Amino acid sequence: RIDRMKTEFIANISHELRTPLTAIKAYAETIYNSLGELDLSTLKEFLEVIIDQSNHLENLLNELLDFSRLERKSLQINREKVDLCDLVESAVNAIKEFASSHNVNVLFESNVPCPVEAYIDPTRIRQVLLNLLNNGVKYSKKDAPDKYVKVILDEKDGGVLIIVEDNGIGIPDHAKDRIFEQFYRVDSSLTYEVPGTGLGLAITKEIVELHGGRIWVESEVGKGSRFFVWIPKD
Amino acid sequence: RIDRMKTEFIANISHELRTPLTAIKAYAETIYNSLGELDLSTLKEFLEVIIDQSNHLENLLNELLDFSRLERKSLQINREKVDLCDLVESAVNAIKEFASSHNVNVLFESNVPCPVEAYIDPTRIRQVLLNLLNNGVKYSKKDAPDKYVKVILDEKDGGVLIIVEDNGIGIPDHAKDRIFEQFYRVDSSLTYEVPGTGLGLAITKEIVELHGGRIWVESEVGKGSRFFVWIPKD
Amino acid sequence: SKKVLLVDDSAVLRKIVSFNLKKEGYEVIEAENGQIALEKLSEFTPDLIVLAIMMPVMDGFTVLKKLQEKEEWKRIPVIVLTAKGGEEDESLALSLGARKVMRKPFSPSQFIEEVKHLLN
Amino acid sequence: SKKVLLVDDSAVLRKIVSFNLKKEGYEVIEAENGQIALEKLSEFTPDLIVLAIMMPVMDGFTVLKKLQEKEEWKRIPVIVLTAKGGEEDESLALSLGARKVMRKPFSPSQFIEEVKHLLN
Ligand SMILES: Nc1ncnc2c1ncn2[C@@H]1O[C@H](COP(=O)(O)OP(=O)(O)O)[C@@H](O)[C@H]1O
Ligand SMILES: Nc1ncnc2c1ncn2[C@@H]1O[C@H](COP(=O)(O)OP(=O)(O)O)[C@@H](O)[C@H]1O
């Protein structure tokens, strides 16, 4: 959108990608220079780091790409009849290691009985969930014994209402109306070290719209945030 | 600059970094799944590929960074008495492998005896030279037996004149005023597969201008291009 | 026994895909671009073609098209292995006659399963 | 022999730098953030501190500042190892009392050369 933001966005891609790349290069050089000083357990572990860090770097490039394909109207949806209960459970599982690395518990509740059959693109809604769940982890409290991110299913106003709730840092009022924009991070002393580009919620907003749905937020600074996603059923 | 360019830029970062990442990941997985079917010389070779492709990915991220540090005016040149003849040779050496991978010969003449003492920042003029040399390789002819990039050193107008000349694809006239703009890439059937962001020449210009110098281009489509860099001797 | 024509502009990528194919006992012929690929079809008939998209001289979409325009070449299965992962790129490649499109970065072991599937 | 205090918020980075330090004979104490690091100095005195910048709870610039504001702590050499490689970042860290700033991504062998130099 803006231009002052664009130059900040360019410096943030550099910094977010540099972290896995540091691991990749240090691990590879170490294996190469230390072949006689690694046991088999450690060699395999170090190779798995390279692979896992590559997979994280890859996810970040798919974000940049997905963001261009939404800006080019060249992105489209294939709806199906998915069990939403099972889809959330899948997403919750995919984020478990990242959540553990930040001491964040990931919960899933359904207010309604399961299955919750609704007509959606499974790939793209999983990506909506992952972005929200990831943000719950990244923006969790810095030092607290009871950090959580909770996904809540309900059926409402015809469609399905998905809430992603956290007890994280929260979001100031002036920021609430800007967090879904492109290249927009709520700069503050509580976000300084957290990596990102500002595309995750812009992307999530576009995908929710393409389903005919909407997304909004409620937050309290110091307490936490709730992201509401409403998509029609059929 | 413009926004349509930004949607293109974003997709181009994704594509330029995905190539080395693909090699990193494939080579790492292959080592991990083939430790019984790998001899030592092959193991070491595959590890070196991971390391070299990491180094290339790192170079690309240093470009996004330098671009943001120039675009936020934070970048600060730091000058010394440098022998340009040495600096050029060092640059020629650094590109030899990449040049060879595309069958491009890299030469050096310069019209003056060496040494050629100049008052410049050696790191940043190396980056200028490497970007021009890189471009001479990237935009070389698709299928020719005598491809080259040549650095010509002279002293002119009470300053140093560096020419980087190639017998590459050349540049159409409409594009010649646009190529130094951030994000600008010539879109043609001869540039389709060539990876890049459109930042390199934007960066090169700002560095040249922080030295109180200028950069311009002469080209003919189908024949080649000459980039002229004039920096004051003081 | 089975012969694979591997078509990609990156020597680094040809090398790692060749390693994994030879680890299964397949023979591998390499081509650096689409034109060189079509040139080698004079010399033999592969059981499989592994094809990139973004190559100088002749890109992969053009190779796929040219493969349909000749009885002898028409029936050779093609796996497209490409960094252009978009849904429209994929649909174009499948409409041009590709049997499978896989994205880069790729898992070598999933790649190999699919090479086997298509060979059997 | 010599004891190193390694301060970075990435478990993955700590592990590889610790592996390389232990390969030289050094003992390694780890801290996930700047505050935890200052807390560990109550229990020992390192011969060297390896310090990142972007950490939660207490960043590396604050750690460097606080290290200068106590007599016992101010002479411990610190090598800053950081993805913030700007020249101003560097000059701030050196003004804050860091002996050396090394950028990420880094070479493990060059890093170890520098550790060795600072220790001798
Ligand atoms: N759960 C959350 N708690 C607090 N802040 C959040 C949360 N989710 C998003 N944000 C804020 O919204 C901004 C935009 O989020 P997003 O678009 O995913 O970008 P990024 O995570 O890359 O910054 C973030 O920088 C952050 O300031
Ligand atoms: N030596 C050259 N020959 C032909 N075209 C060139 C040459 N150098 C630069 N160009 C053209 O100018 C554009 C901008 O160059 P640059 O800023 O270095 O970005 P990039 O190489 O990432 O596209 C290139 O996309 C290309 O079209």
Author numbering:
A (entry chain B), B (entry chain A): 246 to 479
C (entry chain D), D (entry chain C): 2 to 121
The authors write:
TCS are composed of two main players, a sensor protein called histidine kinase (HK) and an effector protein called response regulator (RR). The HK catalytic core is comprised of an ATP-binding domain (CA domain) and a phosphoacceptor domain containing the phosphorylatable His residue (DHp domain). RR activity is controlled by the phosphorylation of a conserved Asp residue located at the N-terminal receiver domain (REC domain). Thus, we have explored the relation between the effect of the pH and His rotamer-dependent phosphorylation from a functional and structural perspective solving the structure of several HK853–RR468 complexes at different pHs.
